[PDB]
Coordinates of C-alpha atoms and ligand atoms in Angstrom, one line a residue:
X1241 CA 101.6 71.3 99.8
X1242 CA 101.7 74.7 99.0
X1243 CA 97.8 75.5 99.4
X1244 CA 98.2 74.1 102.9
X1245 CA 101.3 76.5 103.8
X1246 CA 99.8 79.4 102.2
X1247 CA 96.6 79.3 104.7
X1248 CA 99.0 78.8 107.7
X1249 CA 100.6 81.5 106.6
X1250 CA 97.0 83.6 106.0
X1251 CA 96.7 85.9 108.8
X1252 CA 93.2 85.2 109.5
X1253 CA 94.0 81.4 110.4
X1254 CA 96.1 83.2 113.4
X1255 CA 93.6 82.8 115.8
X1256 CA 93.3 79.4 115.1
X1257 CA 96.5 77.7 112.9
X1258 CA 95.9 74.1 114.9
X1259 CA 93.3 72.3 112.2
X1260 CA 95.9 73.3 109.4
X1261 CA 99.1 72.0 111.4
X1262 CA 97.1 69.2 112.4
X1263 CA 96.5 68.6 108.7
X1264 CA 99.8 69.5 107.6
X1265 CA 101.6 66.7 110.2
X1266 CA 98.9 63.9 108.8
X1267 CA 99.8 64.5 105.5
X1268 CA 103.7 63.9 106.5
X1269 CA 107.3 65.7 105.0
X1270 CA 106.4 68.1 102.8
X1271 CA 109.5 67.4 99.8
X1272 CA 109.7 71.2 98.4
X1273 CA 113.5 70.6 96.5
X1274 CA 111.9 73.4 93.5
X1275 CA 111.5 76.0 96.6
X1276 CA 114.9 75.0 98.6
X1277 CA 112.5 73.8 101.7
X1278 CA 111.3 70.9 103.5
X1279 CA 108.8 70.8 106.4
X1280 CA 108.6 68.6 109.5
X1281 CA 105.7 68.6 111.4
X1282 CA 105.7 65.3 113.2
X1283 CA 107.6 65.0 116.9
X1284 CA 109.8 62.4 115.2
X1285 CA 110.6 64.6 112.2
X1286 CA 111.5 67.6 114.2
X1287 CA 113.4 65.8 116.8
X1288 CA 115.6 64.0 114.4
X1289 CA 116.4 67.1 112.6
X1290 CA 117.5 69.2 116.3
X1291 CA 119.6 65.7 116.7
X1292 CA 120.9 65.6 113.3
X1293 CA 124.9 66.4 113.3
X1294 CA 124.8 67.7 109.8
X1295 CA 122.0 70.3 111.0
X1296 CA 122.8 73.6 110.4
X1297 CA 121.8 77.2 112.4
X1298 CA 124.6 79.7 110.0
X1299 CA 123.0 81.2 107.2
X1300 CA 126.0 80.7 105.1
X1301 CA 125.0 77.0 104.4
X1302 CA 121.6 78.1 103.2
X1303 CA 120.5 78.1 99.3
X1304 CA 118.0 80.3 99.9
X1305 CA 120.5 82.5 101.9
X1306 CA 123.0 82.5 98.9
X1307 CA 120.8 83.4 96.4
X1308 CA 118.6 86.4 97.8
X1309 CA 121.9 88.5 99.2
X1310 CA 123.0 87.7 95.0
X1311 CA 119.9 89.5 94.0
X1312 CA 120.0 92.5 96.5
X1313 CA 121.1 95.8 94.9
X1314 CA 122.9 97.4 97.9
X1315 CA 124.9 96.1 100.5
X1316 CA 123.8 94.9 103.6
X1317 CA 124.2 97.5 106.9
X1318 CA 126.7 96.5 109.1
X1319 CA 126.4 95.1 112.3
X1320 CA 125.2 91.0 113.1
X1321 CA 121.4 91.9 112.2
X1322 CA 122.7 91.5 108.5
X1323 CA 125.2 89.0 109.1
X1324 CA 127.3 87.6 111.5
X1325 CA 129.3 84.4 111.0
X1326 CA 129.8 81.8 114.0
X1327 CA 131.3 78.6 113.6
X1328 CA 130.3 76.0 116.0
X1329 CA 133.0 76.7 118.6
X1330 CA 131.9 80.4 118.7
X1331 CA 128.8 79.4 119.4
X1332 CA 129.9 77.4 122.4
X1333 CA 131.8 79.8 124.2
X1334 CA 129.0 82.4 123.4
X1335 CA 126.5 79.9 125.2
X1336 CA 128.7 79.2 127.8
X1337 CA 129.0 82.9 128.9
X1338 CA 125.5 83.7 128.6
X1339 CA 124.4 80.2 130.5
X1340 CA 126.3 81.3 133.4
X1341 CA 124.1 84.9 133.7
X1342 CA 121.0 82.8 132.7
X1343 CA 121.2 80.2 135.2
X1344 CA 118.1 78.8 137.2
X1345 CA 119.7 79.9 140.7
X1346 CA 120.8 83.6 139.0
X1347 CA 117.9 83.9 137.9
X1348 CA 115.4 82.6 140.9
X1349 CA 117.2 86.2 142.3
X1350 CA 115.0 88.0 140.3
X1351 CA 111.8 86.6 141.7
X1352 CA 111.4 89.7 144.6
X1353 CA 111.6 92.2 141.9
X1354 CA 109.2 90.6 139.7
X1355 CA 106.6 89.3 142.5
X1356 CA 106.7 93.3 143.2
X1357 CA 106.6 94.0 139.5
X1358 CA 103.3 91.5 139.3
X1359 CA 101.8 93.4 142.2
X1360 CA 102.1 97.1 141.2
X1361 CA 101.0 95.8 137.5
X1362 CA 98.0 94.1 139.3
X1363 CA 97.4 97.1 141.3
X1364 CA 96.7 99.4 138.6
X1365 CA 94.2 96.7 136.7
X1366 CA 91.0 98.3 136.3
X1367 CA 87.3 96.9 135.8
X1368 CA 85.1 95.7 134.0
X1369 CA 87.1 94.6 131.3
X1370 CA 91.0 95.3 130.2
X1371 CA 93.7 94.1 128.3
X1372 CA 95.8 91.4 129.3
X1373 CA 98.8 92.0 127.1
X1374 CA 99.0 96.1 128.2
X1375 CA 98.7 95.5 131.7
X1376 CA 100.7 92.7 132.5
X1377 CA 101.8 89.7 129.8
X1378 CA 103.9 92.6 128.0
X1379 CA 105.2 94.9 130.5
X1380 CA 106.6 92.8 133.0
X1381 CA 109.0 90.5 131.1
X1382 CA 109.9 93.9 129.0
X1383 CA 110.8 95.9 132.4
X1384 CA 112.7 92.9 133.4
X1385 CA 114.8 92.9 129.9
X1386 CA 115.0 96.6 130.5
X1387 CA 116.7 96.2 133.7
X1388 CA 119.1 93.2 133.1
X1389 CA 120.1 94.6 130.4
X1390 CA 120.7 98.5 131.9
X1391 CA 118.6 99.6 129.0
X1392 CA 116.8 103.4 130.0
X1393 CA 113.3 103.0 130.6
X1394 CA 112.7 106.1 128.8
X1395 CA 113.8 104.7 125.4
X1396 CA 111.7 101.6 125.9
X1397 CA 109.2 102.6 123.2
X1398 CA 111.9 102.6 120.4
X1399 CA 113.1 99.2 121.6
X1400 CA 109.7 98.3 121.7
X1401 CA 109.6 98.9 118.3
X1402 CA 112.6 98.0 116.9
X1403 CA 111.5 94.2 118.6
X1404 CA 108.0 94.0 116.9
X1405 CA 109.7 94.6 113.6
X1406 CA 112.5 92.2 114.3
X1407 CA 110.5 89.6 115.7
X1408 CA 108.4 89.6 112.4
X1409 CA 111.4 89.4 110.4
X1410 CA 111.9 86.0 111.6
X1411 CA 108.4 84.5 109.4
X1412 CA 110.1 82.1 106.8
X1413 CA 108.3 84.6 104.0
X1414 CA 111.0 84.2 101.4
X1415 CA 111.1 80.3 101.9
X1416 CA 107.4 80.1 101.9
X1417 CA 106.0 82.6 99.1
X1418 CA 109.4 83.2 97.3
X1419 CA 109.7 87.1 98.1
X1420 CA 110.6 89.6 100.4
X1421 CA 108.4 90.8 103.6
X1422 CA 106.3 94.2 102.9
X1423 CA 107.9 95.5 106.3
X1424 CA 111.5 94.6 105.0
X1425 CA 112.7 98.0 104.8
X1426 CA 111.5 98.7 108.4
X1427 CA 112.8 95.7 109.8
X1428 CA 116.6 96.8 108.2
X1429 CA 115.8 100.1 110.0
X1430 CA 115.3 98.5 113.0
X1431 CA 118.4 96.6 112.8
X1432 CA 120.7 99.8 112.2
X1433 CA 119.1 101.4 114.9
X1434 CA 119.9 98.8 117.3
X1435 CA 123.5 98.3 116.3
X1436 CA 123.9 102.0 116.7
X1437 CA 122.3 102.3 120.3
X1438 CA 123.8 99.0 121.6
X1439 CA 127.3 100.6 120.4
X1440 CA 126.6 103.7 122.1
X1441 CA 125.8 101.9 125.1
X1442 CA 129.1 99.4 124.8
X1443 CA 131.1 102.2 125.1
X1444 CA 129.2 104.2 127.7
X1445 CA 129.5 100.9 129.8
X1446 CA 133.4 100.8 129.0
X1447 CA 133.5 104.3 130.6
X1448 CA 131.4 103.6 133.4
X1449 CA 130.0 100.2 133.9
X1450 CA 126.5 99.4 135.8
X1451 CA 125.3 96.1 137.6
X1452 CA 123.7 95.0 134.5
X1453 CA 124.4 91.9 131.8
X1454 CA 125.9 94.1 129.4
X1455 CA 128.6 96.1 131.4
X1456 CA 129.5 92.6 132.5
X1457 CA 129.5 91.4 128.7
X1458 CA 131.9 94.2 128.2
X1459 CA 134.3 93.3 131.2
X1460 CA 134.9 90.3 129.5
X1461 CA 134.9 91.8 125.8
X1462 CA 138.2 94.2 128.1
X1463 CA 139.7 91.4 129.7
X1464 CA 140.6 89.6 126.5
X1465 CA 139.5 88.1 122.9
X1466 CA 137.1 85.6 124.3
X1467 CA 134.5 88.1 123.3
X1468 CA 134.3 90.9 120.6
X1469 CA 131.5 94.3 120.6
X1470 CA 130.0 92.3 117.5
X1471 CA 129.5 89.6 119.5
X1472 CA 128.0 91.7 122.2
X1473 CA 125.6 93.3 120.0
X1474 CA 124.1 90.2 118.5
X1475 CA 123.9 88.9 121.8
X1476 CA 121.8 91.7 123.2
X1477 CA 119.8 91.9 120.1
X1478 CA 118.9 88.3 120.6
X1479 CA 118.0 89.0 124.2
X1480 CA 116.2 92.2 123.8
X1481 CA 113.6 90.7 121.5
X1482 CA 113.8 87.6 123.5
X1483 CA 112.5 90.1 126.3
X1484 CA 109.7 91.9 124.5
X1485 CA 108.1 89.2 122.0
X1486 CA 108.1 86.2 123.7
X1487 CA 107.0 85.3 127.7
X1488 CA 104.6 87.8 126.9
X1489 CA 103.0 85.2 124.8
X1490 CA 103.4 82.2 127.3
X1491 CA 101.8 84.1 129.9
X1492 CA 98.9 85.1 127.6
X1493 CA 98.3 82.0 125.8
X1494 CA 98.0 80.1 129.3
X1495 CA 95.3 82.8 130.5
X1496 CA 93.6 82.3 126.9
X1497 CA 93.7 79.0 127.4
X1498 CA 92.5 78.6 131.1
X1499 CA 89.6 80.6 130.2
X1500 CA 88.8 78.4 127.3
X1501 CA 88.9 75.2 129.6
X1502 CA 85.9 74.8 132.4
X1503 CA 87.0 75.1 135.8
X1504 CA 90.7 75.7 134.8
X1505 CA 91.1 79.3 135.6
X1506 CA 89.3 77.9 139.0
X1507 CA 91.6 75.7 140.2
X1508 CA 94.7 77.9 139.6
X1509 CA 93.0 80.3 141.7
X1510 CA 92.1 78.3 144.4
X1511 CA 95.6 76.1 144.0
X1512 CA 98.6 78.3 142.9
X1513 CA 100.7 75.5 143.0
X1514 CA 99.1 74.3 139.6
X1515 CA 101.4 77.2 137.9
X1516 CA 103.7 74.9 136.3
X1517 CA 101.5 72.4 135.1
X1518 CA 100.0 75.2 133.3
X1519 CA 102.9 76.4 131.9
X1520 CA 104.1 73.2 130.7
X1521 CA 101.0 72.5 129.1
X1522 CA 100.2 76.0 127.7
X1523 CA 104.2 75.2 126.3
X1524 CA 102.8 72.3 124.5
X1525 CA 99.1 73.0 123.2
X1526 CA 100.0 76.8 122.3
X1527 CA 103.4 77.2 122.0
X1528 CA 104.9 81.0 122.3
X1529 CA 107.4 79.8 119.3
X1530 CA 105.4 78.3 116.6
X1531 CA 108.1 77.1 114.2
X1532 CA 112.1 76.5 113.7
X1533 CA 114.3 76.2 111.0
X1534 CA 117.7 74.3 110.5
X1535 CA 119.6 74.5 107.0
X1536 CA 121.1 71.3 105.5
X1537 CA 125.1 71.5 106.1
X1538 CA 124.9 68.2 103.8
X1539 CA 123.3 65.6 101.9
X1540 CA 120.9 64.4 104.9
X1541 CA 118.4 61.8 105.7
X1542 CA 115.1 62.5 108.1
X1543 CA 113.6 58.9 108.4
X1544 CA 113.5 58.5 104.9
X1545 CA 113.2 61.2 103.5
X1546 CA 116.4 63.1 101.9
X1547 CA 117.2 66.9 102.1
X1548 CA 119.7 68.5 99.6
X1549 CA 122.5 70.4 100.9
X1550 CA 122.1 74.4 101.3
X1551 CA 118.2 73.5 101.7
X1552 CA 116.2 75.0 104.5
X1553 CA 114.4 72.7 106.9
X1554 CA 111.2 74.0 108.2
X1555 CA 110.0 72.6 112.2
X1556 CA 106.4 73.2 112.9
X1557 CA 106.8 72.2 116.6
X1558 CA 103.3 73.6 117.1
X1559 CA 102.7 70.6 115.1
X1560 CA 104.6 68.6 116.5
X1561 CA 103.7 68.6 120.2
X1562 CA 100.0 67.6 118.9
X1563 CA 101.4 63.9 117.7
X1564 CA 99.4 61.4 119.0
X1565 CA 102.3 58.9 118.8
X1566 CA 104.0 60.9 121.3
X1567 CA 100.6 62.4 124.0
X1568 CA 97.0 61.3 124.3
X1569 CA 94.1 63.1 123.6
X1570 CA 96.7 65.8 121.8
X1571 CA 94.3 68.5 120.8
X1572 CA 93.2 68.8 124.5
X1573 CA 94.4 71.8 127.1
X1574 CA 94.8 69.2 130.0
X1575 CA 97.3 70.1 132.9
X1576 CA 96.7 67.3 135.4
X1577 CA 98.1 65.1 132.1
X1578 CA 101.3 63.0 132.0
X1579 CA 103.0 65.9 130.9
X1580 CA 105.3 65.1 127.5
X1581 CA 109.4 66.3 127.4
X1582 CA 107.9 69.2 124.5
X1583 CA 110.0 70.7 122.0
X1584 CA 109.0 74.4 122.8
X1585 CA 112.2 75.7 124.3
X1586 CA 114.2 74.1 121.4
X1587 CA 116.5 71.1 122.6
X1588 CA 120.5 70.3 122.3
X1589 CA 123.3 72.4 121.5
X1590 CA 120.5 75.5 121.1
X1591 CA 118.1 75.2 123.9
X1592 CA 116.7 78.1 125.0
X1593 CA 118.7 79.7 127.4
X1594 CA 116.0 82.1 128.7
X1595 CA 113.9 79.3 129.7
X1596 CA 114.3 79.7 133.3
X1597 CA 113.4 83.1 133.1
X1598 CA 110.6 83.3 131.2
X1599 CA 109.1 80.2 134.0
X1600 CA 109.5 82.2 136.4
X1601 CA 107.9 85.2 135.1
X1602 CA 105.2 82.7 133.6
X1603 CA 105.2 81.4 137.5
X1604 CA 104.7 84.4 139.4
X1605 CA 102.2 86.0 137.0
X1606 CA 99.7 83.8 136.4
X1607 CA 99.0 82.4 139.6
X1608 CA 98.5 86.2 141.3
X1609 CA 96.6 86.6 138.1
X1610 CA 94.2 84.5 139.0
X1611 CA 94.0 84.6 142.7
X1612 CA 93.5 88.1 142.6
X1613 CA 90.2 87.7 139.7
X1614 CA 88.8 84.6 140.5
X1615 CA 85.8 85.7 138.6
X1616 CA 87.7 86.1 135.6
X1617 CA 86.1 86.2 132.0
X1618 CA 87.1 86.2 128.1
X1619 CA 85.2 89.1 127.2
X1620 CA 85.6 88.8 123.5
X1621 CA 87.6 86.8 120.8
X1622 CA 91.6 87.7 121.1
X1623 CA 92.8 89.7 118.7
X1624 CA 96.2 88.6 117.0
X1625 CA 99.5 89.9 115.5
X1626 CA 100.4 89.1 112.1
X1627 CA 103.4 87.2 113.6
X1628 CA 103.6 83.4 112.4
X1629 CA 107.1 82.3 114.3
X1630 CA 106.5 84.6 117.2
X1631 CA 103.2 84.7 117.8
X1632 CA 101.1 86.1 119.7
X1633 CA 97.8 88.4 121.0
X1634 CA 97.7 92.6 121.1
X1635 CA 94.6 92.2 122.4
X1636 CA 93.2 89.7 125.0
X1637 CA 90.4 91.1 126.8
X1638 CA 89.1 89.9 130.3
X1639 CA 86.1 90.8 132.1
X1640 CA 86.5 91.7 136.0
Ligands
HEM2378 C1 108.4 81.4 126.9 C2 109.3 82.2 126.3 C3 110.4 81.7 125.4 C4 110.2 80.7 124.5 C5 109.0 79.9 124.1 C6 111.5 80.5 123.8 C7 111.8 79.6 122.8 C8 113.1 79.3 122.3 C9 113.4 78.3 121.4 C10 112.4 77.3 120.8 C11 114.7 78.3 121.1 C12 115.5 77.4 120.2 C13 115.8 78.1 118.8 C14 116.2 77.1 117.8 O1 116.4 75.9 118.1 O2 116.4 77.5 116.6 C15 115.3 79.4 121.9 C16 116.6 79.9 121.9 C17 117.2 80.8 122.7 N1 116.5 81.6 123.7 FE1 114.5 81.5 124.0 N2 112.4 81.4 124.4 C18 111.7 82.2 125.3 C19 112.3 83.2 126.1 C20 113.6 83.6 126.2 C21 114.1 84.6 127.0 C22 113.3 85.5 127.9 C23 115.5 84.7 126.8 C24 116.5 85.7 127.4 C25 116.3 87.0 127.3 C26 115.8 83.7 125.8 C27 117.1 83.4 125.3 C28 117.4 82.5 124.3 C29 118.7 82.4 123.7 C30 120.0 83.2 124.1 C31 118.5 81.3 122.7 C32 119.6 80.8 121.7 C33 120.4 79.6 122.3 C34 121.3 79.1 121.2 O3 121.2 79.5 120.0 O4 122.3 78.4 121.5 N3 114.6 83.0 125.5 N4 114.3 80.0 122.6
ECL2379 CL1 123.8 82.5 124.0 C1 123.9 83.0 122.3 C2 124.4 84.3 122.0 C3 124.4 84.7 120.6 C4 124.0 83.8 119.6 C5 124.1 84.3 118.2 O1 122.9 84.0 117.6 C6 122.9 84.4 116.2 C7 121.9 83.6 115.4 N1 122.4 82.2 115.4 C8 123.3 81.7 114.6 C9 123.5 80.4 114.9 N2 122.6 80.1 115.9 C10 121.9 81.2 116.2 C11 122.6 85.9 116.0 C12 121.8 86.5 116.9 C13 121.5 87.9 116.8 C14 122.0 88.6 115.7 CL2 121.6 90.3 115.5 C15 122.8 87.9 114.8 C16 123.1 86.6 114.9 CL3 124.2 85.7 113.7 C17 123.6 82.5 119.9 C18 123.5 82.1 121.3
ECL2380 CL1 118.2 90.8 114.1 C1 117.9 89.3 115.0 C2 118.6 88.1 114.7 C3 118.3 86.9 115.5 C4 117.4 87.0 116.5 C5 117.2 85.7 117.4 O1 115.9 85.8 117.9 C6 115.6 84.8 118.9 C7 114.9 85.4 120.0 N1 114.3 84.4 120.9 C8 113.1 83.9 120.8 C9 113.0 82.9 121.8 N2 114.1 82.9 122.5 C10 115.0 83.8 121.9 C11 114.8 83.7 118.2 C12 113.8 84.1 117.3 C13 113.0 83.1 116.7 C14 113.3 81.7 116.9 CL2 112.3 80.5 116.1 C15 114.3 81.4 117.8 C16 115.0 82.4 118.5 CL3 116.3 81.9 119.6 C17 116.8 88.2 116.9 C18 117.0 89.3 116.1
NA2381 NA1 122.4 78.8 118.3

């Protein structure tokens, strides 16, 4: 159990993590009560546990939570980066205001800007080979965060920074290997700089407001207690990194995987209609998010086994949408399949809320993508962050 976890969590299994989740799910729950952890890995598993009513998101209810900020030396910084307690009805109204901005017909508006965006990006592609994730999977969802969220364009290379460190921070290290990340002290950096910047901005906005998500965040924040500047921040932190570490990695992973499968990279650009399909699939057979994690608010069963209270429940929904109980030939990049209902956007009372965004994005880049290089190549093996949760390609190089 451990062995198995420990080469999942090897950086040179990156490229390839599929044999050991496919391993890890035959095997079944993973019982870890010494370490405070449990892992799911089958659809059924990891469906029941997003069901389960006792299923926790708050870090409060965490062992493993509990103990490590009773080891620390210092404090925590301030700000919602360290901590930020929701209970589940502060959750809902935070989800109901940010549903309303994220909505499928608000957000089909953006499809001008971003049809331009793919254009210019495309524009400036140059042959014979380049990089996939510097000219257009990691821009173009990052200039569209940028801009929703009136964030200067000119200080996109410290939130580009401050993302990559906070989107690391989210590898279940300390549940997994029983210590601390290495990059722990940059990732706290990160997170005070945030806070600070975000304030600054808050109050810039109160001043003098903009047409962007966050100057409307704060015209509700004015207009009564139905949302705080905490609240606010964590919000924006969440969307910011959303922005920068994660489409990025649909849109790659579905060119990676078109170019892997004969003919695939073909169709799409002969048929742009086969976009979602694509996206669907690439949401299943590489998923952008790799993994989830619920804590145990109580004494709870998943099929039969039991978790103890406090523990931390591990979802490998990479695992998960490979189940052949739940989607035939599972291992297989197929998007003319009987597509499956996947778990890659999260379901229930945390479904991704960005969802409709980053399809769209997805939808409008790939498609151009491929009409405009039909000829289209993998040059050379991808090259991979260190990133287990949110992970992803630095490098994915195509010849032209
Ligand atoms: C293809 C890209 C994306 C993928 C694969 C993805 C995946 C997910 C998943 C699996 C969850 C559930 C987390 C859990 O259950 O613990 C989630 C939540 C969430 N996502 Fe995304 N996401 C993507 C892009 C985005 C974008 C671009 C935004 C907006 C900027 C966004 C906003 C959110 C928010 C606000 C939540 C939290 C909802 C809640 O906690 O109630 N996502 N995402
Ligand atoms: Cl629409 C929406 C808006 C905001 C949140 C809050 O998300 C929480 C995490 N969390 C806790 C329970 N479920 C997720 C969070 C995000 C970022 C930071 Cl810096 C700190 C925290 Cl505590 C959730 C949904
Ligand atoms: Cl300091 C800080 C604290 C909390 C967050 C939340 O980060 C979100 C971003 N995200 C990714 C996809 N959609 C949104 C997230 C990360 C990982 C997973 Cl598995 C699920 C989610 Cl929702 C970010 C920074
Ligand atoms: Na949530």
């Amino acid at each position: 159990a451990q062995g198995l976890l420990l080469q999942l969590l090897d950086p040179a299994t990156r490229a390839d993590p599929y044999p050991i989740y496919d391993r890890i799910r035959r095997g079944g729950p993973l019982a870890l009560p010494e370490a405070n952890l449990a892992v799911f890995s089958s659809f059924s598993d990891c469906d029941d546990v997003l069901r389960h009513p006792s299923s926790c998101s708050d870090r409060t209810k965490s062992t493993i939570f509990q103990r490590q900020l009773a080891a620390e030396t210092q404090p925590r910084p301030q700000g919602p980066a360290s901590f930020l307690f929701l209970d589940p009805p502060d959750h809902t109204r935070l989800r109901g205001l940010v549903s309303k901005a994220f909505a499928p017909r608000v957000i089909k508006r953006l499809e001008p800007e971003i049809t331009a965006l793919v254009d210019q990006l495309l524009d400036a592609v140059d042959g014979p080979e380049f990089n996939l994730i510097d000219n257009l999977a990691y821009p173009l969802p990052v200039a569209v965060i940028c801009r929703l969220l009136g964030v200067p364009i000119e200080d996109e290379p410290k939130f580009s920074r401050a993302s990559a460190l906070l989107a690391a921070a989210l590898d279940p290290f300390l549940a997994l290997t029983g210590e601390t990340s290495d990059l722990f002290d940059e990732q706290m950096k990160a997170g005070m700089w945030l806070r600070d910047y975000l304030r600054a901005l808050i109050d810039e906005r109160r001043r003098t407001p903009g047409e962007d998500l966050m100057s409307g965040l704060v015209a509700v924040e004015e207009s009564g207690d139905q949302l705080t500047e905490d609240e606010i921040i964590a919000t924006c932190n969440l969307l910011l990194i959303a922005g920068h570490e994660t489409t990025v990695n649909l849109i790659a992973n579905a060119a990676l995987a078109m170019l892997r499968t004969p003919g695939q990279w073909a169709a799409l650009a002969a048929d742009g209609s086969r976009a979602s399909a694509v996206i669907e699939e690439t949401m299943r057979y590489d998923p952008p998010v790799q993994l989830v994690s619920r804590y145990a608010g109580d004494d709870l069963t998943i099929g039969t086994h039991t978790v103890p209270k406090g523990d931390t429940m591990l979802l490998l929904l990479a695992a998960a949408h490979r189940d052949p109980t739940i989607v035939g030939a599972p291992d297989r990049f197929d998007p003319d399949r009987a597509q499956i209902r996947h778990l890659g956007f999260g379901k229930g009372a945390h479904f991704c809320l960005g969802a409709p965004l980053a399809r769209l994005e997805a939808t409008v880049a790939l498609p151009a993508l491929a009409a405009r290089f039909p000829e289209a190549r993998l040059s050379g093996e991808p090259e991979y962050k260190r990133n287990l949760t949110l992970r992803g390609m630095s490098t994915l190089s195509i010849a032209v």
